[PDB]
């Protein structure tokens, strides 16, 4: 019965990315080797099984700094964080493996599934 | 060049609504007459010119309680908050006027514009 705004979700995500771009209401720093990335936990939780599981745990939910696995590649992480906030995944031959393995670690199964299709599409 | 996930934004919004439903990482209470509504400021800012303007102001950005104009109808507010988090607007003859006037106050111009089309479509 309700009216559907078909661009509203993407508009929200776009604005949330603009907020990240300005460091407005970001509440966590993700450290990946020597790089740091600020983000909104709510967005992370919405997009990643690893961050969902971390922050739903009232023991961890107020963490302000998350140190990721040192083996994780920051470029892979950065590509996935961009994806979270934009719905666009920058998959390329030079990065498919680091992205796929990072998406496995972050428990982003649709992305991993898409990464497999990409290998299969060559 | 990048791969577009066409359902990702709506999936994010759906998960953010589930987080609200569980009061996970909500950081503001909106008081409207005798009713209270918890929400995420980031979502509010993304969807409303009034909340954007309030919370971008470093003077107001850490407010945990916002008292809205007492004349605002809580049902109208509640319909608009649901819309923010779902992209579905529950517009009905019994509520078009309270929704439109609430959307004016919250500076949700596409919604106001849509409310006018609704009156014109009768
Ligand atoms: O679903 C998410 C995060 N997420 C995104 C893709 C994706 C994924 O592929 N596998 C997982 N495995 C862990 C898990 C599985 C089901 C629900 C929750 C977590 N998790 C993912 N978060 C969420 C769920 C329900 N309510 C609010 C929120 Cl924020
Ligand atoms: O646009 C919004 C909020 N919003 C949603 C619909 C809507 C609206 O119809 N009129 C207004 N008038 C005030 C305004 C006008 C332009 C930008 C910002 C505020 N504001 C709206 N927020 C935002 C913008 C840029 N970067 C990050 C964010 Cl969160
Ligand atoms: Cl801030
Ligand atoms: Cl919480």
UniProtKB/Swiss-Prot annotation, chains A, B:
The lineage of its organism: Eukaryota, Metazoa, Chordata, Craniata, Vertebrata. The chain holds residues 7 to 128 of 706 of the full protein. Induction: Down-regulated during maturation of dendritic cells by selective stimuli such as bacterial lipopolysaccharides (LPS), CD40LG and zymosan. Protein levels decreases upon genotoxic stress in a dose- and time-dependent way. Homodimer. Interacts (via BTB domain) with the corepressors BCOR, NCOR1 and SMRT/NCOR2; the interactions are direct. Forms preferably ternary complexes with BCOR and SMRT/NCOR2 on target gene promoters but, on enhancer elements, interacts with SMRT/NCOR2 and HDAC3 to repress proximal gene expression. Interacts with histone deacetylases HDAC2, HDAC5 and HDAC9 (via the catalytic domain). Interacts with ZBTB7 and BCL6B. Interacts with SCF(FBXO11) complex; the interaction is independent of phosphorylation and promotes ubiquitination. It is linked to Chromosomal aberrations involving BCL6 are a cause of B-cell non-Hodgkin lymphomas (B-cell NHL), including diffuse large B-cell lymphoma and follicular lymphoma. Approximately 40% of diffuse large B-cell lymphomas and 5 to 10% of follicular lymphomas are associated with chromosomal translocations that deregulate expression of BCL6 by juxtaposing heterologous promoters to the BCL6 coding domain. Translocation t(3;14)(q27;q32). Translocation t(3;22)(q27;q11) with immunoglobulin gene regions. Translocation t(3;7)(q27;p12) with IKZF1 gene 5'non-coding region. A chromosomal aberration involving BCL6 may be a cause of a form of B-cell leukemia. Translocation t(3;11)(q27;q23) with POU2AF1/OBF1. The BTB domain mediates homodimerization. Its dimer interface mediates peptide binding such as to corepressors BCOR and NCOR2. Interaction with corepressors through the BTB domain is needed to facilitate the rapid proliferation and survival of GC B-cells but is not involved in the T(FH) formation and BCL6-mediated suppression of T(H)2 and T(H)17 differentiationrequired for GC formation. It is found in: Nucleus. Changing residue 15 to K: Abolishes interaction with NCOR2 and HDAC2, no effect on interaction with CTBP1 and transcriptional autoinhibition. Residues 26-93 form the BTB domain. Phosphorylated by ATM in response to genotoxic stress. Phosphorylation induces its degradation by ubiquitin/proteasome pathway. Polyubiquitinated. Polyubiquitinated by SCF(FBXO11), leading to its degradation by the proteasome. Ubiquitinated by the SCF(FBXL17) complex, leading to its degradation by the proteasome: ubiquitination by the SCF(FBXL17) complex takes place when aberrant BTB domain dimers are formed. Signal peptide: none annotated. Expressed in germinal center T- and B-cells and in primary immature dendritic cells. This is B-cell lymphoma 6 protein.
């Amino acid at each position: 019965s309700q009216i559907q705004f078909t661009r509203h979700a993407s508009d929200v995500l776009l604005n949330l990315n603009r907020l990240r771009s300005r460091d407005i209401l970001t509440d966590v720093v993700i450290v990946v080797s020597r790089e740091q990335f600020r983000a909104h936990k709510t967005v992370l939780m919405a997009c990643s099984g690893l961050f969902y599981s971390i922050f739903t745990d009232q023991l961890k939910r107020n963490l302000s700094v998350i140190n990721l696995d040192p083996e994780i590649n920051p470029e892979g992480f950065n590509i996935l964080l961009d994806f979270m906030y934009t719905s666009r995944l920058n998959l390329r031959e030079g990065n498919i493996m680091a992205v796929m393995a990072t998406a496995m670690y972050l428990q982003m199964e649709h992305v991993v599934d898409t990464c497999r299709k990409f290998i299969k599409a060559s």
